[PDB]
Amino acid sequence: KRYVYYPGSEELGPDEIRVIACGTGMPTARRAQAAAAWVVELGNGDKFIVDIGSGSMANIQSLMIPANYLTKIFLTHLHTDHWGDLVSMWAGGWTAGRTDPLEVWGPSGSREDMGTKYAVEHMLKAYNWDYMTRAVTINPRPGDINVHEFDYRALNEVVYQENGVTFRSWPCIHAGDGPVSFALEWNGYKVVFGGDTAPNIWYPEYAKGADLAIHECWATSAQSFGQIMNMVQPRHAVAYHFFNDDDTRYDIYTGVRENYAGPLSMATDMMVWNITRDAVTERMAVSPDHAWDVAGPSEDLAPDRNRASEYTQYILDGRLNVDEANAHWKQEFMG
Amino acid sequence: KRYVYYPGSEELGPDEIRVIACGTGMPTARRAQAAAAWVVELGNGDKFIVDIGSGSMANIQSLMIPANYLTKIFLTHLHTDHWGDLVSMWAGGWTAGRTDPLEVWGPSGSREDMGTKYAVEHMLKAYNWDYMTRAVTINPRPGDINVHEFDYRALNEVVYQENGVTFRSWPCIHAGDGPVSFALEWNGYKVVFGGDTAPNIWYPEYAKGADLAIHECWMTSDQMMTKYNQPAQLALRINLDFATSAQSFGQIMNMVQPRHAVAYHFFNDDDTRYDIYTGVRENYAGPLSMATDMMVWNITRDAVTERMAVSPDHAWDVAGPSEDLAPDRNRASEYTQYILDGRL
Amino acid sequence: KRYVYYPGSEELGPDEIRVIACGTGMPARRAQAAAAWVVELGNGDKFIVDIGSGSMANIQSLMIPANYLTKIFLTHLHTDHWGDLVSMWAGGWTAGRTDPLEVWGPSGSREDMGTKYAVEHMLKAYNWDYMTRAVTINPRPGDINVHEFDYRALNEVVYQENGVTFRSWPCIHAGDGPVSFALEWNGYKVVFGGDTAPNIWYPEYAKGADLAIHECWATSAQSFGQIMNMVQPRHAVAYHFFNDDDTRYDIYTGVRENYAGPLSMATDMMVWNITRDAVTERMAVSPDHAWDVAGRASEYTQYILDGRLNVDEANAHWKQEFMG
Amino acid sequence: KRYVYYPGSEELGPDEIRVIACGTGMPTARRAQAAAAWVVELGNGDKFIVDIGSGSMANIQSLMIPANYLTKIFLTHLHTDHWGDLVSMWAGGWTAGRTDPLEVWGPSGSREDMGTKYAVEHMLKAYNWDYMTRAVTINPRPGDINVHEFDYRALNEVVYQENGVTFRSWPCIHAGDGPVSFALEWNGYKVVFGGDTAPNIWYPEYAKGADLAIHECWMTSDQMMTKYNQPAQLALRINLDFATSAQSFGQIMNMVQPRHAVAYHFFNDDDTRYDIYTGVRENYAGPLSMATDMMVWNITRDAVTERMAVSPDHAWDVAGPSEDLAPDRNRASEYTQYILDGRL
Ligand SMILES: [Zn+2]
Ligand SMILES: [Zn+2]
Ligand SMILES: [Zn+2]
Ligand SMILES: [Zn+2]
Ligand SMILES: [Zn+2]
Ligand SMILES: [Zn+2]
Ligand SMILES: [Zn+2]
């Protein structure tokens, strides 16, 4: 294998997993470091997004994956740094050839309006102008989002079970009731997406023997992160959710290494993990900054001509005549 | 003046404007081009954001301008590529030490549920879990968004007038009723933020003599085909009917006669920029910038200069203060004992 | 094909040429290394044409094993066209190149103005590197074998191996000695103009090139457009200008007054795939954090060796783990 | 103080030094890391280059220092990764408007053909064609290089002394006889540039109490095994015998007790830095930088500060027309009528 990972370029083994950090940073996205996002690709052809915070969509688009393959989204919690770029995935996939609705698994809160189902319904209402104007010229079928809201308090319970893939959830201690951690279990592998938490009694039990154990680390201190991973004994630990600059990262590393000796990644954007029977391998992805979307399906639409136009004649009557300025390139192009 | 703009390094004069392109790209995300965003700094100390598209918050933070100086946001329209980072300016700016509500100017639509007020209302309901948890430990008042929703059909009417600065709005032709252009007037200067439109009769008249005139300039149909794999049909219709083509922008800017025109809202790539430039140059001879992320204009009586910003990968960092940020004690914990009895 | 080229990720077909711009600039800056080109042919042959100051960092990010890039053609002896020869010589021979380098370069009007003089004194310049390295490593890969050809010769063959011809012809640039190259193989013709003011040779000997490279700024944009209209290439490439959001736009305008044909404004890591049916332009996306990929009397006096600091205490703990 | 260093933005104090890492890497080329190169700026206006490795000319250029202010160049040793870019400083510098010869200080070897004097003499012969054609249109005086070859064996002896600035040299153990470390002394400050060495008894004694102490720090035997597939045999050897290991570095800096230590000469990557850092910290507890390209140190009475430089992708002007650059008319053309007759 190449010492760096070029997205689009490597076949996945049937008993292989590929996990890509598409965001690793603090609440704000910064230029070096988008907010929390993960892409899981399974050797069976299944692909999931675990969190999709502010700024992460530029990193996801650089994987060259057709939108119709990235329709299942898991949210750890409803911080803007964990789902702020769902709207970019929603609208941009519905302009880049996604033909299915998006599917989102997210936790409930202590009440209706503290839950993922409420949050997504109001986000779609937020962008009603976008939805209603676009749906005049393009079948809206993909503009939907189907929310699978699970119980936040459930202790390591299944929330997903399709095609030999299980996601399970357990609670986190973070800001307010609702956040959770996920175990992804497939073909004898376990991948643990920590989300955000203060040190709790659930993660060390339910994460145990994970091939890849992701956990927040600054909330959870670097000495705790070390205590937690000592207990879990994962094949590989990943620390994330801190700034990657030349004056904390190194003492974070030290602080972990006080109680945890096992294989350890200090996650940065576009860091990549290959899980096979023999190894857990860490590389960097080298991906286009000047990204475009790549076709996959691009599988017709067939728009309804019954829907009312969102224009009035008052607006349409402002059209400028540009027939002259466009004539030459027009002619030449229609040839 | 240095040939590059280092944010926080240059004092802005009394008769001077600085504009930075914090986003210039598309609804398609890309590390090289955030979606549409413009920061304007005036010599009287007033600062404004016009559009705040998905990803732009990375470039806004690179400017070394504290969050409490960036509370006034103007939106041209309600596409994700123009207001998708509002949520991140809201939540991020709040933890970073803004002490006042966010002020958002935005158009109406043809009915309530097509307007900026409904849009911002539902966005705050969307992030209720975020807001209600934050409001436990920080003053909730910076958490508010005050919307100033103005009539989209209005022809060059003032929507804002305070401390010698005026914003005017006029309509655009884009996807449906609601979208607008802005002209910022201050101290003899006019700055025009075109937003998104097909070629229209209002922009050329109301933009006339602007020191800086920004307008959508589309990728050629060839470049649409080259990538989106289109037929010589829906690639063609885009440049004829729905967007402003490079030739259409040329014609509009010939009419405006600005000191300096800015083309934006295209992928600025090694194999796109040159045929877009030539499209404009067919019908417009005058001073032109092919925008990209972190291009900055300095506006003075003598000159409109174009430079690149050489900016840090800077985040705001949490503003834990005394201040106007003291929490309303009477708010309930958002924890139950079930969660809190889980600490290791 | 993928819309960006990822080096080491694409098999070259038997009737395909790949051409990568490893340097496009002036005398050496961060966006933009000095002139260099890598040509990969579908018969398995690889060449470097120019290796200017800074280019090696781009050549190393291609993930090409060192023993595959041992043939170098120099247009001329400006530092912006062979400054990183030494960095190929030393770093190739660290990276485990087992063969010496072969350098084709032109003569001058006299001995001390040609390539053989230049490379001989280059290796004498780095004698201390050479002589200390040769204590531990076999020095056979340290050699540079120079093929010096007549700078005067009008489109004469300088190289002829495995179905690949290089031809040289003269340039007009600083002084006698600079040349242009045509690479021919399997019906294809790739022209490396090097540096020059407009000359009568290039328009004649570049004619019908699959890819024609020419300096463009010495040669005006307008002049470049005049030349390429006469050359009528499948695809033209302008290079050796600064590519900041300013003068490139007018450079592009200048060319289009006289040349309408396919045209690339070369930047670092720009690559062209040449097939029967197309000449395609993509950008190469490659690692900034590159590594090598595999594919005598002592020079110490005892006075020096006597200065060794004992570091046993300090190195014991890591040592008792690593030995395990 | 801005949290990043913008070059050209910050007046240097009369009691202040700025040091910039213009290359931190290895003999394998890499866009992320040019070969060994250091720029040092004193508050008295004097500036020095210590090492000018292959590829470092890009980073020096980004500092917005004109070429006539960078004529003084000190080499630790004659490896490509410490003087490869001399020729680019030589020819680049001259065209750009250096008025005086290059001044180079470097060590002798055990014989003439192992010294800096021989190396530089043959470098100029190598680029005879460049020199002779340039010498037609510019005054040749800038194209000279005055070499100051000092005894490599001398123990902490002065090799340079002027304007209150002193450089001393002492030997290293690296490849064979000839390599050295420098100490720069000015205004009660000491900056040590270690060059390349295996652990030696001289550096600790002569570097003692440096304000900034730079020393080579090797990747782990672990890391050499992963990348280069070296056997446990030859891997352990590099970090035990020929190189300064991360642990060895920590032993030397614990002895030296600098105000601030700098590790360099290693690939600074997301899977190498952390285990290097950990090796130093086995034996050294004091202030430490793990060097990468465009890191900068400010030395004042109160602090040694580490920041990153946020610099533009700058190339030097290109001098044009001056009086000290006017061409020597006695010089012969290098064109023959055969080449001139080819003009179109
Ligand atoms: Zn959170
Ligand atoms: Zn978070
Ligand atoms: Zn729009
Ligand atoms: Zn838009
Ligand atoms: Zn030249
Ligand atoms: Zn060395
Ligand atoms: Zn070295």
Short mmCIF file of N, CA and C in Angstrom, two decimals, chain D residues 32-104:
data_model
loop_
_atom_site.label_atom_id
_atom_site.label_comp_id
_atom_site.label_asym_id
_atom_site.label_seq_id
_atom_site.Cartn_x
_atom_site.Cartn_y
_atom_site.Cartn_z
N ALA D 32 7.07 20.05 2.53
CA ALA D 32 6.82 20.45 3.94
C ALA D 32 8.12 20.91 4.64
N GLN D 33 9.30 20.49 4.22
CA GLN D 33 10.55 20.72 4.97
C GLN D 33 11.73 20.77 4.00
N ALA D 34 12.24 21.99 3.82
CA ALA D 34 13.52 22.28 3.15
C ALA D 34 14.61 21.77 4.06
N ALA D 35 15.78 21.54 3.47
CA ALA D 35 17.03 21.13 4.16
C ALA D 35 17.50 22.27 5.06
N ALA D 36 18.35 21.94 6.03
CA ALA D 36 18.85 22.84 7.10
C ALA D 36 19.10 24.28 6.59
N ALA D 37 18.49 25.30 7.24
CA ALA D 37 18.66 26.74 6.94
C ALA D 37 18.08 27.63 8.06
N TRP D 38 18.82 28.66 8.51
CA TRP D 38 18.48 29.51 9.69
C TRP D 38 18.73 30.97 9.33
N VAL D 39 17.76 31.85 9.55
CA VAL D 39 17.99 33.29 9.36
C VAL D 39 17.98 33.89 10.78
N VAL D 40 18.94 34.77 11.05
CA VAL D 40 19.14 35.38 12.39
C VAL D 40 19.19 36.90 12.17
N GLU D 41 18.34 37.65 12.86
CA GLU D 41 18.26 39.13 12.72
C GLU D 41 18.52 39.71 14.12
N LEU D 42 19.52 40.59 14.22
CA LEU D 42 19.90 41.25 15.49
C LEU D 42 19.29 42.65 15.46
N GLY D 43 19.00 43.22 16.64
CA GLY D 43 18.46 44.58 16.82
C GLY D 43 19.40 45.69 16.36
N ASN D 44 20.69 45.39 16.18
CA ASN D 44 21.71 46.33 15.63
C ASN D 44 21.61 46.40 14.10
N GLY D 45 20.65 45.70 13.47
CA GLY D 45 20.40 45.72 12.00
C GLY D 45 21.18 44.67 11.24
N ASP D 46 22.16 43.99 11.86
CA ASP D 46 22.93 42.90 11.18
C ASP D 46 22.07 41.64 11.05
N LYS D 47 22.30 40.89 9.96
CA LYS D 47 21.59 39.63 9.63
C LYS D 47 22.59 38.61 9.07
N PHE D 48 22.31 37.35 9.34
CA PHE D 48 23.20 36.21 9.04
C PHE D 48 22.35 35.02 8.59
N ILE D 49 22.89 34.19 7.70
CA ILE D 49 22.33 32.87 7.34
C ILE D 49 23.33 31.85 7.88
N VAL D 50 22.81 30.89 8.63
CA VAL D 50 23.58 29.71 9.09
C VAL D 50 22.96 28.50 8.39
N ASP D 51 23.65 27.97 7.37
CA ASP D 51 23.30 26.81 6.53
C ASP D 51 22.30 27.30 5.50
N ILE D 52 22.39 26.77 4.28
CA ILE D 52 21.43 27.18 3.23
C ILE D 52 21.17 25.95 2.35
N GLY D 53 20.50 24.97 2.96
CA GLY D 53 20.20 23.65 2.39
C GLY D 53 19.33 23.77 1.14
N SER D 54 19.47 22.79 0.24
CA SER D 54 18.58 22.55 -0.93
C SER D 54 17.15 22.88 -0.52
N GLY D 55 16.50 23.71 -1.33
CA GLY D 55 15.09 24.05 -1.12
C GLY D 55 14.83 25.17 -0.11
N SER D 56 15.83 25.67 0.62
CA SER D 56 15.57 26.66 1.70
C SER D 56 15.37 28.04 1.08
N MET D 57 15.72 28.24 -0.19
CA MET D 57 15.70 29.59 -0.79
C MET D 57 14.23 30.08 -0.83
N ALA D 58 13.23 29.20 -0.94
CA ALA D 58 11.78 29.53 -0.93
C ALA D 58 11.36 30.21 0.37
N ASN D 59 11.77 29.65 1.50
CA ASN D 59 11.45 30.15 2.85
C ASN D 59 12.21 31.47 3.11
N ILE D 60 13.49 31.60 2.73
CA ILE D 60 14.27 32.87 2.94
C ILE D 60 13.59 34.02 2.19
N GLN D 61 13.21 33.77 0.96
CA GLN D 61 12.46 34.68 0.07
C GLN D 61 11.17 35.18 0.72
N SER D 62 10.48 34.31 1.47
CA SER D 62 9.16 34.63 2.08
C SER D 62 9.32 35.63 3.24
N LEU D 63 10.56 35.96 3.66
CA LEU D 63 10.81 36.79 4.87
C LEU D 63 10.73 38.28 4.54
N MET D 64 10.69 38.63 3.26
CA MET D 64 10.62 40.04 2.79
C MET D 64 11.87 40.80 3.26
N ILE D 65 13.02 40.13 3.26
CA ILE D 65 14.37 40.71 3.49
C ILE D 65 15.04 40.91 2.15
N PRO D 66 15.45 42.12 1.76
CA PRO D 66 16.14 42.27 0.48
C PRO D 66 17.51 41.55 0.48
N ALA D 67 17.92 41.12 -0.73
CA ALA D 67 19.12 40.28 -0.99
C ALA D 67 20.42 40.99 -0.59
N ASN D 68 20.44 42.33 -0.59
CA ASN D 68 21.67 43.07 -0.17
C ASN D 68 21.82 43.03 1.37
N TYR D 69 20.83 42.51 2.10
CA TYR D 69 20.91 42.44 3.57
C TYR D 69 21.29 41.01 3.99
N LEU D 70 21.46 40.09 3.03
CA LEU D 70 21.75 38.66 3.31
C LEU D 70 23.01 38.22 2.53
N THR D 71 24.15 38.84 2.76
CA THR D 71 25.43 38.62 2.04
C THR D 71 26.35 37.75 2.90
N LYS D 72 25.98 37.54 4.16
CA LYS D 72 26.85 36.86 5.16
C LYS D 72 26.22 35.51 5.51
N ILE D 73 26.96 34.46 5.21
CA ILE D 73 26.49 33.06 5.13
C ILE D 73 27.56 32.21 5.82
N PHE D 74 27.16 31.47 6.85
CA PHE D 74 28.01 30.55 7.64
C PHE D 74 27.57 29.12 7.36
N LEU D 75 28.45 28.23 6.88
CA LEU D 75 28.12 26.80 6.67
C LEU D 75 28.69 25.98 7.83
N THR D 76 27.90 25.07 8.39
CA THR D 76 28.35 24.07 9.40
C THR D 76 29.24 23.00 8.74
N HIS D 77 28.93 22.59 7.51
CA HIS D 77 29.55 21.46 6.78
C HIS D 77 29.08 21.39 5.31
N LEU D 78 29.67 20.49 4.51
CA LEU D 78 29.58 20.54 3.02
C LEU D 78 28.63 19.45 2.48
N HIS D 79 27.64 19.01 3.28
CA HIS D 79 26.50 18.19 2.79
C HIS D 79 25.51 19.07 2.03
N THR D 80 25.01 18.53 0.91
CA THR D 80 23.94 19.14 0.06
C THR D 80 22.84 19.74 0.97
N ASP D 81 22.41 19.03 2.01
CA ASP D 81 21.31 19.52 2.86
C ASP D 81 21.76 20.69 3.76
N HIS D 82 23.00 21.24 3.63
CA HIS D 82 23.44 22.44 4.40
C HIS D 82 24.03 23.55 3.52
N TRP D 83 24.24 23.33 2.21
CA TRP D 83 24.72 24.40 1.30
C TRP D 83 24.27 24.21 -0.16
N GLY D 84 23.33 23.30 -0.45
CA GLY D 84 22.75 23.11 -1.80
C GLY D 84 22.23 24.40 -2.39
N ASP D 85 21.65 25.30 -1.60
CA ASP D 85 20.99 26.49 -2.17
C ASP D 85 21.99 27.65 -2.16
N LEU D 86 23.29 27.44 -1.86
CA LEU D 86 24.24 28.58 -1.97
C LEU D 86 24.15 29.16 -3.39
N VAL D 87 24.24 28.30 -4.40
CA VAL D 87 24.22 28.72 -5.83
C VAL D 87 22.96 29.54 -6.12
N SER D 88 21.81 29.25 -5.48
CA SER D 88 20.55 30.01 -5.73
C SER D 88 20.62 31.35 -5.00
N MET D 89 21.25 31.36 -3.84
CA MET D 89 21.53 32.63 -3.13
C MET D 89 22.53 33.43 -3.98
N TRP D 90 23.48 32.74 -4.62
CA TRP D 90 24.54 33.39 -5.44
C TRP D 90 23.91 34.04 -6.69
N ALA D 91 23.24 33.28 -7.54
CA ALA D 91 22.72 33.80 -8.83
C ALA D 91 21.41 34.56 -8.61
N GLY D 92 20.52 34.02 -7.77
CA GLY D 92 19.26 34.71 -7.44
C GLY D 92 19.61 36.05 -6.85
N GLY D 93 20.59 36.05 -5.94
CA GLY D 93 20.88 37.24 -5.13
C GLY D 93 21.35 38.33 -6.05
N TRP D 94 22.20 37.96 -7.01
CA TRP D 94 22.95 38.88 -7.90
C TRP D 94 21.98 39.60 -8.85
N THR D 95 21.16 38.84 -9.58
CA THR D 95 20.11 39.37 -10.49
C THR D 95 19.17 40.31 -9.71
N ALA D 96 18.86 40.01 -8.44
CA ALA D 96 17.84 40.66 -7.58
C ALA D 96 18.34 41.99 -7.01
N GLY D 97 19.66 42.16 -6.88
CA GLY D 97 20.31 43.46 -6.66
C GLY D 97 21.29 43.50 -5.51
N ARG D 98 21.93 42.37 -5.16
CA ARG D 98 23.14 42.35 -4.30
C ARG D 98 24.26 43.18 -4.97
N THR D 99 24.88 44.13 -4.26
CA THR D 99 25.87 45.10 -4.84
C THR D 99 27.31 44.67 -4.56
N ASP D 100 27.49 43.81 -3.57
CA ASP D 100 28.81 43.41 -3.03
C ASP D 100 28.94 41.89 -3.23
N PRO D 101 30.16 41.32 -3.22
CA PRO D 101 30.34 39.85 -3.28
C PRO D 101 29.52 39.14 -2.20
N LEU D 102 29.21 37.84 -2.36
CA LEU D 102 28.79 36.94 -1.26
C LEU D 102 29.99 36.73 -0.35
N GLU D 103 29.75 36.80 0.94
CA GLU D 103 30.73 36.45 1.99
C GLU D 103 30.31 35.13 2.60
N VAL D 104 31.15 34.10 2.45
CA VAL D 104 30.92 32.73 3.02
C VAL D 104 32.03 32.34 4.02
#
